[PDB]
Structure 1
Amino acid sequence: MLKIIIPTTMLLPMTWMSKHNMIWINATVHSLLISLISLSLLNQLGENSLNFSLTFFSDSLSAPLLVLTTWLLPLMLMASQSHLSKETTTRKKLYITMLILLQLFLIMTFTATELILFYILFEATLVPTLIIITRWGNQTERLNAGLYFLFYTLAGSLPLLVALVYIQNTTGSLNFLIIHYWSHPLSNSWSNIFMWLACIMAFMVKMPLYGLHLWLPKAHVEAPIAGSMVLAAVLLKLGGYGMMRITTILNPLTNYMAYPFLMLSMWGMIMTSSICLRQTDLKSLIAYSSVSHMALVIVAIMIQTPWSFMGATALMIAHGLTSSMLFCLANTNYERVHSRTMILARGLQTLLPLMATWWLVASLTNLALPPSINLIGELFIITASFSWSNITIILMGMNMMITALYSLYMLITTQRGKYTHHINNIKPSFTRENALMALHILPLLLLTLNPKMILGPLY
């Protein structure tokens, strides 16, 4: 695992020793090389995980997330360099350093064998994101957004720390292998109920769960493009990964402790899909769609079936890629017209046809068109829910209908109709933007040929 971590660390002195006009080129090239190297972790053994050492291990769940992070870094660099052109060399190097530190913390988080190290890195991811949002955000609400993002996370995460140290004291270990092999049932008691809550609420708020999701629109809208990319693509999946790791020791309590969370997730996915229908800001719609998809992931994790975990893993990967692509698409238009209002710029298909094609493909993947992996995950989760209870199909179908509705609503509003007359500064699409959209979309379609790479350990 050091063969991935050490080059990521080497990215720091390499970008701090580069010339003022070569930082983007060097960082992009070596980030792509690191992603290529990290692609070798997909070879999984089946029966058990790849245990490199006492500190790190790789699973069929961790490997797609690691590859997604390593692949997302170069796309973040490509998206960032346009709006940072006027910045000084030192501040651009600091921004790239923030991105590299975030990547390092993420790659170490997904491979830790022990839960305290996972917690330490999972909290350490906060600082670079907070710095990025509050320093390179564009509006004045970035400060309030950063405060929300920090405190919503910490209020859930601190009880997790207390629960983890208590569990290590009572059991003697927190190593995930020992945790799994020496699992014992949780009795029906108030102490066990509060232990369950302390082990669950941090990952709940990172998803986010409906009712604890208010930080996400603020943080995702007010962050720069790279910050939004990493928030939607990767940082939302930390909660799901933590849930999959932690629910091993929570049985059989989850059988009834999951009822309020399932109810909240289903009704709130309906609510957020409905909210997307009346939104004046283009980024907030994407944020709320992310909330709905993560609510579906929460249901999948809560029901505790192999098909549910497979669908949840597929949906996490697909949602990460699709949300990153949608955020980049919105950012291109924002850079054109310097406003996030959806109806300001209309009929962009007449002026930008290839970008309209990218918009159409992203909208089609957002509504989970077959045989894309988005629908693979969603269908697996829906089938698992149907096995859990036949009445879930009503809510699943309603959510599907509303998702198609607002996806095509966004597409029609932004791309169709007639152009706004007074707006006359819409230049032809750059090679960088088209390449960024292609690099987002092509892995999505290529993953359809080999769906088992992202289905997870339960495959």
Structure 2
Amino acid sequence: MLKIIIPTTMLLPMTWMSKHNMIWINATVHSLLISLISLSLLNQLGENSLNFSLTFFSDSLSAPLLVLTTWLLPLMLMASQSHLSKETTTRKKLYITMLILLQLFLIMTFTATELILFYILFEATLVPTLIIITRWGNQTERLNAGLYFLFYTLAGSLPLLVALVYIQNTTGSLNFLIIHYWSHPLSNSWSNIFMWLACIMAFMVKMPLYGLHLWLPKAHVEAPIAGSMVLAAVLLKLGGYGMMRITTILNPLTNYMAYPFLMLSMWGMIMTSSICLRQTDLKSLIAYSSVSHMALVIVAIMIQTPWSFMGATALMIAHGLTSSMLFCLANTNYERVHSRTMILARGLQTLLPLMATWWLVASLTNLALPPSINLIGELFIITASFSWSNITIILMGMNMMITALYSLYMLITTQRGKYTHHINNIKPSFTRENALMALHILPLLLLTLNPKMILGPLY
């Protein structure tokens, strides 16, 4: 993994040593090169993982997440250079430094082979994100959003640290391979119940579980565009990766403890879709859609079958790409009219046709349209839930109907109708924005062409 880790730590000095007008060019080009290099991790095995060294290893679950992280960095650079034109050179370099640090922490998080090093990195991702939000956000509420995000995550994750050190004392090791090979059943006792709670609650807060989700609209609405892109596409997936990894040691207690979380996930999936139906803000609509999809992923992990894990992996990758694209589209609209209200700017199809096409494609992927990987993951989760019980189909069908309703509602409201008459500053779409949307959407369809690359280790 060092062939990918070191070039990022070299992005840092290159960013600080490049000229004042070449920072964006250098950062974008070399981020793309590092993404290309990280594409080599997809050549996985059918039996075991890629054990690079004592510290880092890669799997069919880690590799797509690393590729998504490395691919997301240059897109964030493009959106950032859109909205950070008037900044000073030092502050531009500080923003790029925060993005690079976040990418480095995420890479080491997905490739860390110990639960304690994984904990350290997955908690280290909080600082750059908090700085980005509370420093380069636009509105007053960025401070409160940062407080909510930070304290929700830490309240979730501190009992996880206690549980991890306890498990290390009990079993002698926190290495994932050793805890997989030496796993023992978790007896039904109050102590085991609270160990299970510590671990799962950390990752449920990070996911987020319905009822532990308010920090998500607060932070995703109030963050800058790069912050929104990384919060939804990658940072939400630390919870899924952690829950998939740590449930090795939590059986058979997961069979009995998953009822409250499954009930919360299914009902809150319905509730957040219904909220999306009646949102006066576009960014909040996209955030609540993210909550619904992560609820589906939580259901998949909790029911915990080989078909549900594949659907969970596929849905995580697909949601990352789709939500990042939706945030970028909303941000272009905001940079036009300087407001997040959904009904302020209308007729954007007759003012900007190609952006209307991008909106159509992003909203067609947001709802599960076959054969997109969004649908593939959702359908695998639905099938596993059907095997779990036969009323999960009722809840899942209701969720799919509401998802289609609010996605097409967003499309029709923003793009169709008649343009607002007094908004006379809708300049033609930039090549940069068009290329950003294309770079979001083409990999999704190529992943549809080759779907075994994102179905996880259980494939």
Normalised to the residue count of structure 2, the TM-score between the two structures is 1.00
1:340-392 Cα offsets, whole Å, 9 max, x none, are 00000001000100000000000000001000000000000000000000111
1:17-38 Cα offsets, whole Å, 9 max, x none, are 0000000000000000000000
Q: Distance in 1 between matches of 2:26 and 2:187?
A: 55
Any idea what SS the aligned residue of 1:420 has? coil
**Displacement after TM superposition at 1:107 (Å):** 0.2
Number of the residue aligned with 1:262: 262
Number of the residue aligned with 2:119: 119
**Displacement after TM superposition at 1:45 (Å):** 1.1
**Displacement after TM superposition at 1:149 (Å):** 0.2
Q: Distance in 1 between matches of 2:104 and 2:297?
A: 25
Q: Distance in 1 between matches of 2:176 and 2:416?
A: 52
Q: Distance in 1 between matches of 2:104 and 2:270?
A: 36
Any idea what SS the aligned residue of 1:50 has? coil
1:186-243 Cα offsets, whole Å, 9 max, x none, are 0000000000000110100011000000000000000000000000000000000000
Q: Distance in 2 between matches of 1:188 and 1:276?
A: 39
Any idea what SS the aligned residue of 2:426 has? coil
1:149-169 Cα offsets, whole Å, 9 max, x none, are 000000010000000000000
Q: How does 1:60-75 map to 2 (within 5 A)?
A: 60-75=60-75
Q: Distance in 2 between matches of 1:298 and 1:67?
A: 22
Any idea what SS the aligned residue of 2:424 has? coil
**Displacement after TM superposition at 1:120 (Å):** 0.1
1:247-285 Cα offsets, whole Å, 9 max, x none, are 000000000100000000000000000000100000000
Q: Distance in 1 between matches of 2:430 and 2:156?
A: 43
Q: Distance in 2 between matches of 1:88 and 1:2?
A: 33
Any idea what SS the aligned residue of 1:311 has? helix
Q: Distance in 1 between matches of 2:119 and 2:3?
A: 23
Q: Distance in 1 between matches of 2:156 and 2:391?
A: 31
Aligned residues: 459
**Displacement after TM superposition at 1:300 (Å):** 0.2
Q: Distance in 2 between matches of 1:253 and 1:427?
A: 58
Number of the residue aligned with 1:55: 55
1:115-134 Cα offsets, whole Å, 9 max, x none, are 00000000000000000000
Report the aligned-residue RMSD: 0.3
Any idea what SS the aligned residue of 2:111 has? coil
**Displacement after TM superposition at 1:97 (Å):** 0.1
Any idea what SS the aligned residue of 1:349 has? helix
Number of the residue aligned with 1:429: 429
**Displacement after TM superposition at 1:407 (Å):** 0.1
Q: Distance in 2 between matches of 1:124 and 1:36?
A: 25
Number of the residue aligned with 2:150: 150
Q: Distance in 2 between matches of 1:341 and 1:199?
A: 39
- Is 1:170 matched with 2:170? yes
**Displacement after TM superposition at 1:83 (Å):** 1.1
Number of the residue aligned with 2:319: 319
**Displacement after TM superposition at 1:6 (Å):** 0.2
Q: Distance in 1 between matches of 2:251 and 2:324?
A: 35
Identity %: 100
Any idea what SS the aligned residue of 1:110 has? helix
1:85-111 Cα offsets, whole Å, 9 max, x none, are 100000000000000000000000000
Number of the residue aligned with 1:371: 371
1:420-456 Cα offsets, whole Å, 9 max, x none, are 0000000000000000000000000000111000000
Q: Distance in 2 between matches of 1:47 and 1:379?
A: 26
Runs (4+) off by over 2 Å: none
Q: Distance in 2 between matches of 1:151 and 1:116?
A: 20
**Displacement after TM superposition at 1:394 (Å):** 0.4
Number of the residue aligned with 2:105: 105
Flag structure 1 segments of 5+ consecutive residues without an equivalent: none
Any idea what SS the aligned residue of 1:81 has? helix
Q: Distance in 1 between matches of 2:45 and 2:323?
A: 31
Q: Distance in 2 between matches of 1:446 and 1:170?
A: 46
Flag structure 2 segments of 5+ consecutive residues without an equivalent: none
Q: Distance in 1 between matches of 2:74 and 2:105?
A: 16
Q: Distance in 2 between matches of 1:26 and 1:20?
A: 11
Q: Distance in 2 between matches of 1:139 and 1:343?
A: 20
Q: Distance in 1 between matches of 2:132 and 2:109?
A: 20
Any idea what SS the aligned residue of 2:83 has? coil
**Displacement after TM superposition at 1:66 (Å):** 0.1
1:382-425 Cα offsets, whole Å, 9 max, x none, are 00000000111000000000000000000000000000000000
Q: Distance in 2 between matches of 1:363 and 1:232?
A: 16
**Displacement after TM superposition at 1:55 (Å):** 0.1
Q: Distance in 2 between matches of 1:368 and 1:445?
A: 13
1:298-347 Cα offsets, whole Å, 9 max, x none, are 00000010000000000000000000000000000000000000000001
Number of the residue aligned with 1:345: 345
Number of the residue aligned with 1:274: 274
Q: Distance in 2 between matches of 1:83 and 1:252?
A: 50
**Displacement after TM superposition at 1:82 (Å):** 1.4
